[PDB]
Design an enzyme around this catalytic site. Structure first.
Site, PDB file in Angstrom:
ATOM      1  N   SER A 249      -0.437   1.083  -7.513  1.00 51.35           N
ATOM      2  CA  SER A 249      -0.075   1.822  -6.332  1.00 51.35           C
ATOM      3  C   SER A 249      -1.531   2.482  -5.764  1.00 51.35           C
ATOM      4  O   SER A 249      -1.278   3.245  -4.752  1.00 51.35           O
ATOM      5  CB  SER A 249       0.766   2.893  -6.941  1.00 51.35           C
ATOM      6  OG  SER A 249       2.254   2.384  -6.736  1.00 51.35           O
TER       7      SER A 249
ATOM      8  N   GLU B 100       5.608  -4.291  -2.909  1.00 47.08           N
ATOM      9  CA  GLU B 100       6.382  -3.844  -4.242  1.00 47.08           C
ATOM     10  C   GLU B 100       7.757  -4.770  -4.282  1.00 47.08           C
ATOM     11  O   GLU B 100       8.364  -4.907  -3.309  1.00 47.08           O
ATOM     12  CB  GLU B 100       6.681  -2.169  -4.022  1.00 47.08           C
ATOM     13  CG  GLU B 100       5.359  -1.579  -3.931  1.00 47.08           C
ATOM     14  CD  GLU B 100       4.842  -1.257  -5.329  1.00 47.08           C
ATOM     15  OE1 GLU B 100       5.273  -1.712  -6.441  1.00 47.08           O
ATOM     16  OE2 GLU B 100       3.774  -0.282  -5.647  1.00 47.08           O
TER      17      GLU B 100
END
Length: 265
Positions: free
Chosen positions: A42, A140
């Site tokens: 992330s 993602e």
């Protein structure tokens, strides 16, 4: 010396550790495995927000984005709550940085647009900052899952530190967009046990974390001394020896950051 201490941490956590602190006026660069590739996880959400800010007028932050059930495919603490009403670009930037919201990041990638659901344009933004190393290939949740050694969805401590330096301390962004990015990272909720834990309380810390499979735990930060001297700190790690389900170990990053803070004090 410092290399010996970082190697000790690798043995303690059965981990691979990467560290980069760019050189300043009076401090040499700190580097440990700094040119080895590690998964973004992330941490890419910080330069992603920078890309979206740079690409659009500031009032683009007020554009409402709608999304539905099949868009929630990853850890998304904020977007799961607002699915019934939508979220503005500004809200999505906030959630992507401060809660590492994966749906927000996917929607921001789509806002950037272009091939690969936005991943090619994200990579192009890094290239425009002189980063010829990093690459984003998936969104993602898949970007956390590449096997150890695979170059998809990777950066290096060296590369991401120089990117973050330009975004927060340099002139990659105009001052008003720079301040938005900096403030969101300053209010991050996910980093208290990583680089923040290694620096004394009178140092300012802003950061973006990353956590993934194979025990991946990252943190990228800008820190300011009590007299306002800034340093960029990139710490990346994985525990490939434990396989896909290896537990990420935040304490590795806190200890590595404590070592760094001792040198910068």
């Amino acid at each position: 010396d410092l290399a010996d201490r970082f190697a000790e941490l690798e043995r303690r956590y059965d981990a691979r550790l990467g560290v980069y602190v760019p050189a300043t006026g009076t401090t040499a660069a700190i580097e440990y495995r700094a040119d080895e590739r590690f998964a973004f996880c992330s941490t890419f959400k910080a330069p992603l927000v920078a890309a979206v800010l740079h690409q659009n007028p500031l009032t683009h932050l007020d554009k409402l984005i709608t999304y539905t059930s099949d868009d929630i495919r990853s850890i998304s603490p904020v977007a799961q709550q607002h699915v019934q009403t939508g979220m503005t670009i500004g809200q999505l930037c906030d959630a992507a940085i401060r809660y590492s919201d994966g749906t927000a990041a996917n929607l921001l990638l789509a806002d950037l647009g272009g091939p690969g659901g936005g991943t090619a344009a994200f990579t192009g933004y890094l290239r425009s900052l002189g980063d010829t190393v990093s690459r984003l290939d998936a969104e993602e949740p898949e970007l956390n899952r590449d096997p150890p050694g695979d170059e998809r969805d990777t950066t290096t401590p060296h590369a991401i530190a120089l990117v973050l330096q330009q975004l927060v301390l340099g002139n990659a962004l105009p001052p008003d967009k720079r301040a938005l990015l900096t403030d969101w990272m300053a209010r991050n909720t996910t980093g208290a046990k990583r680089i923040r834990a290694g620096f004394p309380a009178d140092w300012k810390v802003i950061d973006k974390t990353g956590t993934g499979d194979y025990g991946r735990a990252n943190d990228i930060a800008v820190v300011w001394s009590p007299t306002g001297v800034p340093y960029v700190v990139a710490v990346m790690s994985d525990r490939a020896g434990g396989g896909y389900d290896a537990e990420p170990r935040e304490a590795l990053l806190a200890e590595a950051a404590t070592c760094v803070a001792g040198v910068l004090a």
